[PDB]
Write a protein that binds this DNA or RNA. Structure first.
Lengths: 511, 497
DNA sequence: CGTTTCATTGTTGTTCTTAGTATATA
DNA sequence: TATATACTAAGAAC
């Protein structure tokens, strides 16, 4: 997939003044565009960015005219984002003293897209305009503009100082015009395409999520020996690691090729050096001694397999397996290979039967040849959009461990007295992060942890920024929004003072 | 027990003419049975607990050597870490030709005295220096009365055996086989810790397993703190680990010596030698290059001091199976660090169990690690089958995935089935029932790798080529369910594949 | 006063890294 | 036909 980005900011005069209690739309949307460029910089996505800082005291645009396409400075055309562009935006921008129309800039960016998005392969186009709606605009080309946006496949969004839920009549009629235009583009849902500037901060503050496409792995779901079904396996949860590694580079020269991580194999006697990649043969420890195994004998005596071999070993009760024992690296999602409906309905029969009879399947698994086989739970899942089945590694016997762990109900030496018990009751009721809402028993899960970005990547991108935007400078601390993000929502902490206080007088806390 | 200590098992077989050639029939032989048992258990212990100690020592023989130069005692291989050099020594005796070798090298089996046998095997345990976790002696005999002739020998036998019982050493016999004379109340009810002619206790010593174990090994102790002031001591333990094959060691091609890898890094422009301070980390973004300290590339992870951060609590239905991320772990208090914290741990566990509610936490296993979100879902203990620990009581560690893990699925529409197919699938899924047990299966790869390891260690006449329950038993599925595959075909299958 | 013995502190296993090979996709 | 994108599978580091 591909996308084209053309941001449009105004550099007029009105945004140079605002209420002293709130930052001006100039600097507000300025921080917004800065950190948006940050987003599409860190993400390696092939999105190409262009900038139009219209409302200029001059006019530097390919469509310059006396009154047609006037007061526009195209910052740079539709190419890849890069740091120096961000720095120049942070610096080169200047407060203005003029006022200019935005439909002008909209058509200018339209022409840029029509002039470049066909010269290079593209799939979907986006136009974004930031302004304060203090312009003098005529509704002449709006029909034609929206027509071209439909034909050129460009989505228009507007971002405005006011909130939908104190502006000039100029701004008010501009807002009505904006509503008309957006509805004239998509429909009644055009209301959602209206955006303020504070909510832009709220919805944008986090760094870009690391989206990760999976692989269409089709497999033959085998049950018995005569009921093969094409099954499409997909990954659901994977411990995500950064894409490209920390390249090791020499100081004061900063070239990668100037370093060799060559390995040399020696002998313990007199430091004799062994020839690197043919005199060594891999051994193994069998008690005291070492057995000269090898690589060729490895490939000859290694265990073999037929291949995909996703074959059902059998069916079992839900409680017959447990949460604890789930031994997977990753959790697959088991869906039908598309375009074969009969397979899908057969799988649906499977899933629903397992669900109502709370039965669970156990299937031999293997991603492919030369890979270790795998046995684990095949759990079925139901969603109103679609039924689901998921596969997880469950342990082999050597993988399971056993421990005594002397029990606790023998607490004649610990003695949880009733005062402590009802104290802990007061706690676990009072710090209850989740509490029922909307009478639908959707508890107060304002800590889902499922929508929350991984702070590791957040810190990594923040570091790369802070030491990219600057030359050598010391690192900053954790941005407070990250900490507020990681910490529980405040009200839970507020409710917690009294119960923890009653804890501190009821237990021993030796050093 | 003390972890660095190790298990020690000594082997001791009646070498008299009694069972050397008992062979009432021609299908077994007690010496060919005892040596088979020793070989099997010892090869299993090779892979299982290679750190432990074994020894084999025969009594009643005619040749002599031991620590004290006594009569009719032979220490075949002393107490030491197990190894192939002794697999072969034991194997040298397996066979009718092998028993001929054994008899004409050590003896037909002379007179003996189990007093002196207990005296001498005690010396063996005393000798070795490593601390011992458990100490067990296995006899191999069927002369259920060692001597009804000299009562003084038998009195000294009770005395010395009781001493060994009080020096920290256990003793055990499996009654192998005898025509009559298959009782333990005759002189042995006071020795070992109704009866028949063969021991079930020796059959399991042929179960021939290649598992491996680690003791009660705390993965990491972290101080769970309820808030900024209340802190309790928790030992993060591991209950499933996904064992990998033991890491191979690089050996020299003829000399089989260790090769002591010596990887390094140095310059290409000059023949210098870069030192760890002399290198910088780097990335490439936005067509511009980045530099940071090797120190800084790990400072970019400093997020919280080690420990556990409890925030609130959740209903166990909201914690979903659908979003497993990593192997779970276990939570159990460790009394050593914060005295009395076990009480608060127990209080939290009991009360959370009572109100059927989860506990959420931030987990920072060590320094330089970003935190994840983990659920302290309590676990009740179950012992019902034989009053032995099955599910340890405490808390899970159900790691909760971060947003960057969801892996947005390529949406496809759904098609309901008709209740006829699901009604027959009810019988389908019923028929293929089988109870699942946690230890039901084995890795074919790990097992086969270990097997090939013994095969090469010994050059035993073929590798074992173990067949393992991982492969399905196809005939069973074709039979016990019937031909209902064609029923579901005629229900929901058009001609195309 | 010298010699011997014993007990304890350093010991690591695990995770992450890079590799390598893998393939289809554009 | 080229390019990278994926994976697993290694490694060693700590």
């Amino acid at each position: 997939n591909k996308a084209a980005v053309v941001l449009c900011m105004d550099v007029g005069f009105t945004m140079s003044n605002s209420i002293p209690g709130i930052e001006s739309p100039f600097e507000q949307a300025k921080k917004v565009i800065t950190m948006f460029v940050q987003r599409q910089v860190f993400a390696e996505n092939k999105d190409e960015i262009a900038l139009v800082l219209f409302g200029t005291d001059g006019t530097d645009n390919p469509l310059s005219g006396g009154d047609q396409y006037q007061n526009i400075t195209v910052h740079r055309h539709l190419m890849l984002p890069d740091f120096d562009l961000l720095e120049d935006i942070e610096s080169k921008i200047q407060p203005g003293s003029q006022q200019a129309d935005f439909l002008d800039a909209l058509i200018v960016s339209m022409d840029v897209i029509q002039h470049e998005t066909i010269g290079k392969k593209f799939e979907k186009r986006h136009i974004e305009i930031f302004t304060d709606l203090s312009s003098r605009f005529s509704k002449s080309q709006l029909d034609i503009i929206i027509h071209s946006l439909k034909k050129c496949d460009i989505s228009l969004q507007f971002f405005l100082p006011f909130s939908l839920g104190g502006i000039t009549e100029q701004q008010k009629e501009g807002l009505e015009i904006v509503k008309m235009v957006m509805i004239s583009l998509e429909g009644e849902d055009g209301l959602d395409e209206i955006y303020s500037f504070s909510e832009s901060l709220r919805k944008l503050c986090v760094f870009k999520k690391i989206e990760r496409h999976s692989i269409h792995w089709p497999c033959r779901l085998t049950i018995g020996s005569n009921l093969s079904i094409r099954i499409a396996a997909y990954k659901s949860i994977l411990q995500e690691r950064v894409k490209k590694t920390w390249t090791v580079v020499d100081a004061k020269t900063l070239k990668k090729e100037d370093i060799q991580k060559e390995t040399v194999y020696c002998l313990n006697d007199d430091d004799e050096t062994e020839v690197l990649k043919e005199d060594i043969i891999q051994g193994f420890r069998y008690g005291s001694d070492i057995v000269p195994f090898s690589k060729v004998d490895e490939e000859q005596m290694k265990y073999k397999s037929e291949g995909k071999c996703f074959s059902v070993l059998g069916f079992c009760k839900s409680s017959q397996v447990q949460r604890r024992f789930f031994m997977g690296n990753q959790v697959l999602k088991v869906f039908a290979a598309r375009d074969d409906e009969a397979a899908a309905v057969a799988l649906s029969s499977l899933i629903h039967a397992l669900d109502d009879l709370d039965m669970v399947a156990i299937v031999r698994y293997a991603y492919d040849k030369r890979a270790n086989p795998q046995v684990g739970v095949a759990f079925p899942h139901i969603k109103h959009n679609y039924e689901c089945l998921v596969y997880v590694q469950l342990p082999f016997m050597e993988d399971l461990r056993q421990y005594m762990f002397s029990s606790l109900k023998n607490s004649k030496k610990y003695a949880p007295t009733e005062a402590q018990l009802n104290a802990v009751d007061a706690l676990i009721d009072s710090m209850s992060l989740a509490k029922k809402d909307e009478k639908t028993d959707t508890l107060e899960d304002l800590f889902p942890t499922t929508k929350i970005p991984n702070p590791r990547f957040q810190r990594l991108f923040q570091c790369l920024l802070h030491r990219a935007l600057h030359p050598r400078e010391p690192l900053p601390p954790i941005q407070q929004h990250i900490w507020n993000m990681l910490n529980p929502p405040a009200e839970v902490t507020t409710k917690s003072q009294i119960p923890l206080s009653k804890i501190k007088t009821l237990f021993p806390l030796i050093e | 027990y003390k972890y660095s200590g190790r298990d020690s098992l000594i082997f001791l077989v009646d070498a008299s003419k009694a069972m050397f050639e008992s062979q009432s029939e021609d299908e077994l032989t007690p010496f060919d049975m005892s040596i088979q048992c020793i070989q099997s258990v010892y090869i299993s212990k090779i892979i299982s607990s290679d750190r432990d100690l074994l020894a084999v020592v025969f009594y009643g023989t005619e040749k002599d050597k031991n620590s004290v130069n006594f009569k009719n005692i032979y220490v075949l291989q002393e107490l030491d870490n197990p190894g192939a050099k002794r697999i072969l020594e034991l194997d040298q005796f397996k066979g009718q030709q092998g028993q001929k070798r054994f008899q004409d090298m050590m003896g037909h089996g002379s007179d003996y005295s189990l007093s002196e046998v207990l005296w001498v095997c005690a010396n063996l345990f005393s000798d070795v220096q490593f601390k011992m976790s458990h100490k067990r002696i296995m006899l191999f005999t069927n002369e259920d009365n060692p001597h009804g002739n000299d009562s003084a020998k038998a009195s000294r036998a009770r005395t010395k055996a009781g001493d060994l019982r009080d020096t920290g050493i256990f003793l055990d016999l499996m009654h192998l086989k005898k025509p009559g004379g298959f009782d333990i109340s005759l002189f042995y009810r006071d020795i070992i810790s109704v009866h028949f002619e063969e021991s079930s206790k020796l059959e399991d010593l042929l179960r021939k397993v290649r598992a491996k174990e680690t003791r009660k090994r705390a993965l990491s102790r972290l101080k769970l703190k309820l808030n900024k002031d209340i802190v309790i001591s928790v030992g993060i333990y591991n209950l499933v680990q996904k064992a990998l094959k033991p890491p191979p060691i690089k050996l020299y091609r003829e000399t089989n010596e260790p090769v002591k890898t010596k990887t390094r890094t140095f310059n290409t422009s000059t023949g210098g030698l870069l030192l760890p301070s002399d290198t910088k980390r780097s990335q490439i973004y936005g067509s511009r290059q980045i530099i940071l300290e090797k120190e800084e590339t790990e400072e970019l992870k400093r997020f919280d001091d080690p420990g556990l951060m409890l925030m609130g609590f959740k209903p166990l239905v909201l914690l979903k199976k659908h979003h497993y991320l990593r192997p779970s772990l276990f939570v159990y208090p460790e009394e050593s660090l914060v005295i009395g914290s076990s009480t608060l741990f127990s209080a939290l566990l009991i009360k959370c169990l009572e109100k059927e509610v989860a506990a959420l936490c931030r987990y920072t296993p060590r320094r330089n690690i970003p935190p994840y979100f983990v659920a302290l879902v309590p676990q009740e203990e179950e012992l019902d089958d034989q009053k032995i620990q099955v599910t340890p009581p405490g808390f899970q560690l159900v790691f909760l995935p971060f947003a960057d893990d969801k892996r947005k699925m390529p949406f496809t529409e759904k098609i309901m089935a008709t209740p006829e197919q699901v009604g027959k699938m009810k019988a389908i899924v019923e028929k293929l029932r089988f109870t699942y047990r946690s230890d039901s299966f084995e890795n074919p790869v790990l097992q086969q790798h270990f097997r090939n390891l013994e095969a090469l260690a010994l050059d035993l006449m073929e590798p074992e080529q173990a067949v393992d329950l991982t492969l399905p038993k196809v005939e069973a599925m074709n039979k016990r369910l019937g031909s209902l595959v064609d029923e579901f075909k005629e229900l929901v299958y058009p001609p195309d594949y």
